[PDB]
Design a protein around this ligand. Structure first.
Ligand SMILES: Nc1nc2c(ncn2[C@@H]2O[C@H](COP(=O)(O)OP(=O)(O)CP(=O)(O)O)[C@@H](O)[C@H]2O)c(=O)[nH]1
Ligand SMILES: [Mg+2]
Lengths: 158, 148, 86, 101
């Protein structure tokens, strides 16, 4: 049985922990044995934290992850602009340029959308990674989001 | 504070790393205290768009041997601020090594460090061989050399 | 302007004076003729190949190729380079 | 495109450059300024084939990728009746040390 170490990163307040809680407990106020494409595998979701710390100890913890979920809230334009900074820090620690990655637009159950889905789709095509719109409250796209990253780690590892 | 160190300008400037050397380039960034930090390597003939900041220092070495490399026909690279968004280019090349230093690289790449003193060369070349290049000894030279 | 460089086995190499001045040892010696009693012909020719390589590629501003050194020549070439200061 | 050559005869070897579009007769004129011998008493060869005074060095087999500065090509020279092309060979390096294998 192959294990997958996934990491959820993003701006402060985008829903990193909420997505992880709902993915595991089906609850909205970390390991899960999942069958993806007929393959039994375990999802080891790492701490989401979010505090800014540029130490070698933090780099060592993030370097262990194989796939990264870059999250932004569709109602917060700043969380979308920060996606570039989060993606570059991921490439720096992983020592690679094509890291298994999936862009995630969280909080799509909200009526104050300030980021067009086409803007994220255009950004996703530029980075060569898939994009998925999710909602931790409604569990919309939450399973589609994490599974899609799992498909990227396998395709990356071939 | 060390003279050779980066400034916390926090102003981003897009840089293009171009490796036109037959070596695997190790981009080394001097932090805000003069301590070198390694970064992802560039295979030969490869180019990568880099996110950096104004006033930050960069140097380039061979990823495996830590030989010296040239950026823009110079050893140190400082990007300015992007003029109207135009990114700044960093063209990594091989330096025209001295025939002595070039021979040292070839001998080091063929003999284990334990068997250096087993070669039919003069006793001085043993010390020259085991004086492997590093960033620390070079940083001391570029520090004292930048005085005006 | 050329100079003559004679090896230990009697091979005379005619290189441009600017190219020969690349080494400090030859610069101190020069007249128009220099002899090396301890440098064989196959090693002195390679040094002249470095001379032509160094003068041509010092002014290049985009990319430089690697200077090839065979394993069978490296040790002899290293001692000659150390003696020539180049 | 520049070509880099080793004009060799007996125990003499000249390190010089030229243009791939330059003439063999022009190269003989370069040997004239170095060894003080006219082109009428010179015969330039590529290996064992005589080079005509009208063809270009490229048309003889000396291109930019065959005559790099770090690996120049070899041109034979014979002086005057002409003599047989004789190029004395360079020395040989010793047996590669057991350590470098
Ligand atoms: N409506 C809605 N609210 C959400 C969603 N995801 C998270 N939230 C809300 O956003 C807030 C932050 O959620 P949380 O998961 O803690 O965010 P985070 O990115 O982990 C914040 P930090 O980085 O500081 O730990 C909470 O008030 C939570 O209820 C979502 O999909 N929909
Ligand atoms: Mg959290």
């Amino acid at each position: 049985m192959t294990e997958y170490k996934l990491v959820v990163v993003g701006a402060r307040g985008v829903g990193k922990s909420a997505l992880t809680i709902q993915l595991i407990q089906n609850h909205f106020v970390y390991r899960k044995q999942v069958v993806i494409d007929g393959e039994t595998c375990l999802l080891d979701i790492l701490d989401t934290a979010g505090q800014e710390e540029y130490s070698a100890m933090r780099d060592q913890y993030m370097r262990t992850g194989e796939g990264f979920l870059c999250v932004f809230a569709i109602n917060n334009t700043k969380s979308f602009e920060d996606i570039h900074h989060y993606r570059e820090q991921i490439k720096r620690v992983k020592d690679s340029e094509d890291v298994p990655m999936v862009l995630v637009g969280n909080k799509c159950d909200l009526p104050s959308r300030t980021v067009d889905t086409k803007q994220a789709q255009d950004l996703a095509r530029s980075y060569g990674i898939p994009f998925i719109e999710t909602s931790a409250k409604t569990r919309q796209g939450v399973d589609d989001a994490f599974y899609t990253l799992v498909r990227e780690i396998r395709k990356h590892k071939e | 504070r060390p003279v050779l160190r980066s400034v916390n300008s926090r102003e981003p400037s897009q840089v293009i790393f171009c490796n036109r050397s037959p070596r695997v380039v190790l981009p080394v960034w001097l932090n805000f205290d003069g301590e070198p930090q390694p970064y992802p390597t560039l295979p030969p003939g490869t180019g990568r768009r880099i996110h950096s900041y104004r006033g930050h220092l960069w140097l380039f070495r061979d990823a495996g041997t830590h030989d010296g490399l040239l950026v823009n026909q110079t050893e140190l690279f400082v990007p300015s601020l992007n003029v109207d968004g135009q990114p700044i280019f960093a063209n990594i090349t091989l330096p025209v090594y001295t025939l002595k230093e070039r021979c040292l690289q070839v001998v080091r790449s063929l003999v284990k460090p334990e068997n250096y003193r087993r070669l039919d060369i003069v006793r001085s070349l043993y010390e020259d061989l085991e004086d492997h290049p590093n960033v620390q000894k070079d940083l001391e030279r570029l520090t004292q050399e930048r005085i005006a | 302007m050329y100079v003559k460089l004679i090896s230990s086995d009697g091979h005379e190499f005619i290189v441009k004076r600017e190219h020969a001045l690349t080494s400090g040892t030859i610069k101190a010696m020069l007249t128009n003729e220099v002899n090396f009693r301890e440098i064989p012909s196959h090693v002195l020719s390679k040094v002249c190949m470095y001379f032509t390589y160094k003068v041509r590629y010092t002014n290049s501003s985009t990319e430089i190729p690697e200077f090839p050194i065979a394993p069978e020549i490296a040790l002899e070439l290293l001692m000659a380079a150390n003696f020539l200061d180049c | 495109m520049d070509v880099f050559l080793m004009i060799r005869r007996h125990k003499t070897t000249i390190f010089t450059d030229a243009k791939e579009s330059s003439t063999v007769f022009e190269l003989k004129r370069i040997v004239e300024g170095i060894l003080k011998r006219p082109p009428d008493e010179q015969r330039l060869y590529k290996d064992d084939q005589l080079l005509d005074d009208g063809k270009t060095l490229g048309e003889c087999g000396f291109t930019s990728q065959t005559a790099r500065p770090q690996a120049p090509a070899t041109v034979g020279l014979a002086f005057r009746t002409f003599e047989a092309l004789c190029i004395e060979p360079f020395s040989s390096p010793p047996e590669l040390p057991d350590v470098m294998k």
